[PDB]
Design a binder for this molecule. Structure first.
Ligand SMILES: [Mg+2]
Ligand SMILES: [Mg+2]
Ligand SMILES: [Mg+2]
Ligand SMILES: [Mg+2]
Ligand SMILES: [Mg+2]
Ligand SMILES: [Mg+2]
Ligand SMILES: [Mg+2]
Ligand SMILES: [Mg+2]
Ligand SMILES: [Mg+2]
Ligand SMILES: [Mg+2]
Ligand SMILES: [Mg+2]
Ligand SMILES: [Mg+2]
Ligand SMILES: [Mg+2]
Ligand SMILES: [Mg+2]
Ligand SMILES: [Mg+2]
Ligand SMILES: [Mg+2]
Ligand SMILES: [Mg+2]
Ligand SMILES: [Mg+2]
Ligand SMILES: [Mg+2]
Ligand SMILES: [Mg+2]
Ligand SMILES: [Mg+2]
Ligand SMILES: [Mg+2]
Ligand SMILES: [Mg+2]
Ligand SMILES: [Zn+2]
Ligand SMILES: [Zn+2]
Lengths: 162, 266, 38, 97, 38, 177
RNA sequence: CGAUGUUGGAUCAGGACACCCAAAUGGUGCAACCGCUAUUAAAGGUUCGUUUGUUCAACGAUUAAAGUCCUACGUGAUCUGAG
RNA sequence: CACAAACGCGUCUCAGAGAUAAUUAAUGAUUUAAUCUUAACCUAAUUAACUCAUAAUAAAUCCAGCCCUAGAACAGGGCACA
């Protein structure tokens, strides 16, 4: 991995690019002929929002996702992983992947509401005051439709709207 | 054995008094305006019992204050026993004041009208003049029906009380009933004058309740008069502590005193 | 801002951004091109 | 080039880019030189002196910017990307000067 | 009683609705996705 | 088995106190099992007319979790009766005002709609935190399992498990995060 | 149809927002004052008079404004009977 | 205003915090640029509602009779200074 360091001395600035050792891929993938990382490690339709050990492999230290041209994923797997990362960040998983602000960490606010499988942004949803009757019912989306193809051991389809 | 006296704090609340509404008197200001003040006489105001903050509200302590003395022969056994343990004759009105823990006073302590000072705002709580079962026109100010253009037995009726589709009347409907005998509070009444000899407060404006009624008076709780407790005696007024008698009448900075040079404008 | 059901860019400087759950045509050169998806 | 043109390079004295074209990690520095020696950058300030030093054994591509605040910004670019180098240079120019 | 041809989509019988739901098209699905297959 | 009639009756129809931790648990999944225990549908001697019903003590009520955006989408509607007195409060606002309210309403809704609902609601004790009076604490018998398995956050993971999990991709050395 | 009593007005109004006023903003062929549109918001208000039975309508004087509707074209076991 | 009262035409008083919708910007990935973010992290300027500070009530088991600024009845306040 590459880092940029800045040095200031006597109104003179020097920026340097330092390369440190980075982890490499594990020696034995179960499906070596796959052209895609997830699809060759046999994790397709196998991860969820709570699999942080996989979701944190490729995200920036401040929580941002990594570009597809760098990660190597196929488009659908990239979208699924991006949605899973968003859901984990909203649920509260990955607590060390946030920027550090000492000035803003002191003014504590109201306690965070526990949540999980959150599809939309918490600040963009309006409360459903009407809620409809049985024939026209306003359903609350839960989870994401991108993960509707995950393996279901019980056989019951996931309730994405409830 | 007085309880320890604590220094005043920005978020402190004081105890109040239970006075008697004597009457109403005119008063004049040095600028020429004329106000009307109510006389509240502190006849015999005492602290009866103390209740801790956690045992009462969890935010403030409760001090119980008793007003004018009554007869022993018309009180219940429990009340008479309570006053016998306390050591004071029975009182007529008993009220509860929410104070801070630093303003607590030992029970049995007397309270005087010098507890308030000329130039201050107070809250006055009392039971208003009860007018009994009053009609809707006097209870709610409803306009009546016309007098003589043909109306038959409807000159003061409320009229329609609800809507046809609802098939009922809402719980907030204004209808004839009791009017007057309820507790009301007047906020932000100015104190103009304190008569120490007779223990009387001259409070600005009107006071709820009939004359010669027991009135619960305390410091104003409006946000505009939150921190005027600084200059006032914080725990209470102790006439035996200063060892110097207060003046018979304490006036405000704008009150035209009875002995005046008959103010003329320049 | 004009509230519309269909958003279209009226120049080359209009950019489409998703905010508050809606889609927006924001424009800096021509502020009259501000459109909000209903 | 457009980013530097829209910055007002009037307050820059000398920019010298010293590199070895036969190396394998001078592409970013060469792109930086091309971006900083463009026609728009030339016309936005004429007194600026742009120098392109070519070596073969230096093996360390670097850039030096000396400007009239008595200030020296030296960037030894062996792993720095051209876009990052341009952004850092633009930020420093708009900060001091 | 509505005509055979209307403008309001002329909601069907429940048996017909069930018939259409059963006879909905089911696209074929390969065992392994071929995008990033060899 | 060879009990006398009265002690056998007391043992068979004795009331039981159950504990339920509500930390990071869905209020609906808490309320379903709480209502089952309250009704007594977990007893083979259960009957509608019999008073077979056990006490349920739910702790960590303030730390419940709603799946999805229910915190901002679910609303609770009340009417004071007076005209203009219809209030619709969001789930988050109701939780801030009163932590007990969300799970209390869920259990009340899931309970049967007969007159026994109030009686078996009087046997439900809800506590915002793990601060239970000793009188109630000494009555507890067993703690029911939490219906939802709470996932562990990344820093809670062991280093052994972190290194055991494989690296599915190899980032380039020149890339900068 | 072995009766669901009508316009208008008086009294009291409940509600909706498709907001007239009051509040926060976007665009203007928005220089300022006046304006024109659109977004969000319904806790509170929304006048007195001449003619007409009038709902409407014209006119006079004002207002921050004198909103559009639903409520058995709200309300006659509360009132009037001008039509 | 021919009752000691009632009354207006007369007099007194009327309030702090949070919260938001539309709409502004700060940092910043997917999309190593930018980008207010149905991307996280803390962010700030911001309607009316609505809640809450705060205020009121908040001492149980004497009640025959007689007064009352208390009241339809029942209730409620007084009956030791004089
Ligand atoms: Mg009376
Ligand atoms: Mg009249
Ligand atoms: Mg008649
Ligand atoms: Mg008559
Ligand atoms: Mg008659
Ligand atoms: Mg009904
Ligand atoms: Mg037919
Ligand atoms: Mg008929
Ligand atoms: Mg009949
Ligand atoms: Mg109304
Ligand atoms: Mg609107
Ligand atoms: Mg306006
Ligand atoms: Mg209105
Ligand atoms: Mg009609
Ligand atoms: Mg009608
Ligand atoms: Mg009727
Ligand atoms: Mg009529
Ligand atoms: Mg009649
Ligand atoms: Mg006629
Ligand atoms: Mg950036
Ligand atoms: Mg910008
Ligand atoms: Mg309160
Ligand atoms: Mg009595
Ligand atoms: Zn793939
Ligand atoms: Zn445009």
């Amino acid at each position: 991995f590459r880092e940029v360091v800045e040095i200031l001395d006597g109104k003179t600035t020097i920026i340097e690019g330092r390369i440190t050792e980075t982890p490499q891929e594990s020696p034995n993938p179960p499906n070596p002929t796959g052209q895609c990382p997830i699809c060759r490690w046999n994790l397709k339709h196998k991860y969820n929002y709570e699999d942080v050990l996989l979701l944190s492999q490729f995200i920036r230290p401040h929580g941002g996702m990594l570009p597809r041209r760098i990660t190597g994923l196929c488009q659908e797997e990239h979208l699924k992983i991006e949605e899973c990362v968003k859901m984990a960040h909203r649920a509260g998983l990955l607590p060390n992947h946030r920027p550090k602000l000492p000035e803003g960490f002191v003014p504590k606010s109201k306690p965070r509401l526990n949540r999980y499988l959150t599809r939309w942004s918490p600040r963009s949803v309006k409360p459903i005051y009407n809620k409809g009757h049985r024939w026209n019912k306003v359903r609350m989306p839960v989870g994401s439709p991108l993960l509707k193809d995950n393996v279901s051991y019980s056989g019951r389809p996931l309730l994405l709207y409830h | 054995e007085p309880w320890p006296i604590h220094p005043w704090e920005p978020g402190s609340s004081r105890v109040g008094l239970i006075a008697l509404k004597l009457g109403m008197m005119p008063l004049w200001t040095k600028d020429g305006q004329k106000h009307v003040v109510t006389l509240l006489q502190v006849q015999d105001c005492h602290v009866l019992k103390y209740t801790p903050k956690e045992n009462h509200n969890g935010r403030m302590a409760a001090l119980t204050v008793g007003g004018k003395t009554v007869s022993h022969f018309h009180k219940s056994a429990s009340i008479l026993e309570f006053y016998q343990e306390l050591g004071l004759p029975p009182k007529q009105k008993v009220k509860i004041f929410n104070v801070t823990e630093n303003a607590v006073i030992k029970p049995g302590t007397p309270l005087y009208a010098a507890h308030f000072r000329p130039g201050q705002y107070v809250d006055v709580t009392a039971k208003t003049i009860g007018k009994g079962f009053q009609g809707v026109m006097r209870r709610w100010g409803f306009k009546g029906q016309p007098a003589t253009h043909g109306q038959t037995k409807t000159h003061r009726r409320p009229g329609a009380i609800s809507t046809g589709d609802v098939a009922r009347v809402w719980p907030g409907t204004k209808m004839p009933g009791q009017l007057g005998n309820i507790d009301r509070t007047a906020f932000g009444l100015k104190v103009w004058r304190i008569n120490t000899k007779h223990n009387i407060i001259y409070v600005n404006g009107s006071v709820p309740g009939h004359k010669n009624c027991l009135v619960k008076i305390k410091d104003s709780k409006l946000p505009a008069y939150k921190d005027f407790c600084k200059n006032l005696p914080f725990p209470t007024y102790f006439p035996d502590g200063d060892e110097e008698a207060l003046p018979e009448d304490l006036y405000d900075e704008n009150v035209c005193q009875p002995g005046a040079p008959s103010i003329t404008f320049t | 801002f004009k509230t519309k059901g269909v958003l279209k860019k009226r120049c080359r400087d209009c950019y489409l951004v998703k905010r508050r759950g809606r889609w927006f045509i924001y424009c800096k050169t021509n502020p009259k091109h501000k459109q909000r998806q209903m | 080039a457009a980013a530097l043109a829209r910055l007002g390079l009037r307050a820059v004295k000398q920019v010298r880019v010293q590199f070895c074209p036969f190396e394998k990690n001078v592409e970013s520095t060469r792109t930086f030189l091309q971006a900083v020696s463009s026609e728009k950058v030339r016309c936005t300030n004429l007194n600026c002196s742009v120098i392109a030093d070519v070596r073969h054994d230096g093996s360390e591509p670097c850039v030096d910017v000396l400007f009239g605040d008595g200030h020296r910004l030296i960037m030894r670019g062996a792993h720095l990307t051209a876009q990052e180098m341009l952004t850092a240079f633009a930020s420093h120019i708009q900060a001091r000067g | 009683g509505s005509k055979a041809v209307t403008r309001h989509r002329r909601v069907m019988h429940f048996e017909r609705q069930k018939l259409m739901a059963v006879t909905e098209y089911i696209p074929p699905k390969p065992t392994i996705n071929p995008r990033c297959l060899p | 088995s060879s009990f006398s009639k009265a002690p056998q009756q007391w043992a068979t129809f004795a009331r039981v106190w159950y504990l339920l931790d509500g930390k990071m648990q869905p209020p609906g999944k808490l309320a379903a099992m709480a209502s089952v225990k309250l009704q007594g549908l977990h007893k083979p001697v259960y009957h509608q007319l019999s008073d077979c019903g056990d006490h349920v003590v739910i702790m960590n009520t303030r730390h419940i979790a709603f799946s999805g955006n229910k915190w901002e989408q679910k609303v609770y509607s009340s009417h004071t009766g007076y005209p203009g007195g219809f209030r619709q409060v969001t789930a988050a606002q109701l939780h801030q005002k009163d932590p007990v309210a969300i799970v209390k309403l869920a259990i009340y809704g899931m309970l049967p709609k007969n007159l026994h609902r109030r009686t078996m609601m009087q046997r439900l004790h809800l506590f915002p935190d793990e601060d239970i009076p000793e009188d109630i604490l000494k009555n507890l018998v067993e703690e029911l399992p939490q219906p939802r398995k709470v996932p562990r956050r990344l820093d809670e993971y062991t280093q052994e498990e972190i290194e055991a999990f494989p690296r599915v991709w190899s980032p380039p050395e020149d890339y900068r995060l």
